C-alpha cells in the first residue's frame, strides 16, 4: 500500500456523504446500495463511520459527470478513466466523481460500480495506489466476486496505517 503524499487524512471519524445524481444504467437503489457497501468495506477495517445525507453539504460528494465538469480533470468518454477522487480535505476534498459515459453495472460486466466506488473511496480517505496486484488500490480495474467481498489484506494494512495506532 502507499499513502497519498503529504499524508492527508480526515481528522474526524464520523463523515457524511451525499449522492448528488444517478446513472441511467442502474436503479437509484442499486446506485445507493453500491455506494453504501463500498463505504462499509473501509468502515469495517477502521474507526470511520459514514452517514448519508439527502441534501446539503456532506464531507464526501458523489456524482456522475461527463467530460468537463468543473474541476480541471475532464473525463474522457467510454472506457479509459472511469472515475477519480480527491484526497481528504475541505471543499472538493474527499469528493468522488464517476464518468457518466461508462456502462455501470452490479454484475461481472464492465464496469462494476460497487468495486470502482470502493477503490475511489480509498483515495477519498487518504490512500494512494498500491503495487500489490491483488489490492483494491491497485492502479488497474479488475472484477472480483462482490456478494461477500471484503478488503484485501493490503488495503486493511493501508487504512490501519492511516486511521489505526
Ligand X SMILES: O=C(O)[C@H]1Cc2ccccc2CN1S(=O)(=O)c1ccc(-c2ccccc2)cc1
Q: Exactly one of 11, 28, 30, 120 is catalytic; which is it? A: 120
From the list 49, 92, 133, 141, which residue makes contact with ligand X (rule: CB under 6 A)?
141
- Residues 4, 120: contact at Cβ < 8 Å? no
- Does 102 show up as a binding residue in the annotation? yes
Burial of 90 (0-12, 13-18, 19+ CB in 10 A): exposed
Site map 17..56 versus Ca ion, x via CB under 5 A = ----------------------------------------
In this structure, are strands 60-65 and 96-99 parallel, antiparallel, or unpaired?
Answer: parallel
Contact with Zn ion (CB under 5 A) among 82, 97, 115, 162: 97
Q: Which of 16, 18, 39, 19 is nearest to 28 (CA)?
A: 19
How far is residue 73 CA from its own chain's centroid?
16
Task: Choose among ligand X, Ca ion, Zn ion, none what residue 94 binds, the Cβ cut-off being 5 to 8 Å by kind.
Answer: Ca ion
**Bridging pattern class, strands 96-99 and 83-85:** antiparallel
State in angstroms the smallest separation of the CB of 11 from Ca ion.
Answer: 13
Phi, psi angles (nearest 5°) of residue 114: -50, -50
Binds ligand X (CB under 6 A): choice among 75, 119, 124, 156: 119
Residue 123 contacts residue 117 (beta carbons within 8 Å): no
Count of residues binding ligand X (CB under 6 A)?
15
- Binding to ligand X by residue 82, rule CB under 6 A? yes
Q: Is 59 one of the annotated binding-site residues?
A: yes
Residues forming the site for ligand X (CB under 6 A): 81-84, 115-116, 119-120, 123, 136, 138-142
Summarize the annotated binding site as residue ranges. Answer: 59, 69, 71, 76-77, 79, 81, 84, 91, 93, 95, 97, 99, 102, 119, 123, 129
Amino acid at each position: 500500500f502507499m499513502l497519498t503524499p503529504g499524508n492527508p487524512k480526515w481528522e474526524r471519524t464520523n463523515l457524511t456523504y451525499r449522492i448528488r445524481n444517478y446513472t441511467p444504467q442502474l436503479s437509484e437503489a442499486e446506485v445507493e446500495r453500491a455506494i453504501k457497501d463500498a463505504f462499509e468495506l473501509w468502515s469495517v477495517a477502521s474507526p470511520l463511520i459514514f452517514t448519508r445525507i439527502s441534501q446539503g453539504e456532506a464531507d464526501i460528494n458523489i456524482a456522475f459527470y461527463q467530460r468537463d465538469h468543473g474541476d480541471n480533470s475532464p473525463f474522457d468518454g467510454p472506457n479509459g478513466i472511469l472515475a477519480h477522487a480527491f484526497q481528504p480535505g475541505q471543499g472538493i476534498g474527499g469528493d468522488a466523481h464517476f464518468d457518466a459515459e461508462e456502462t455501470w453495472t452490479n454484475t461481472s460486466a464492465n464496469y462494476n460500480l460497487f468495486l470502482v466506488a470502493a477503490h475511489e473511496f480509498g483515495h477519498s480517505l487518504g490512500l494512494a495506489h498500491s503495487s500489490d496486484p491483488g489490492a483494491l488500490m491497485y492502479p488497474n480495474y479488475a472484477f472480483r466476486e462482490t456478494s461477500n467481498y471484503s478488503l484485501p489484506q493490503d488495503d486493511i494494512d493501508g487504512i490501519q496505517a492511516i486511521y489505526g495506532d
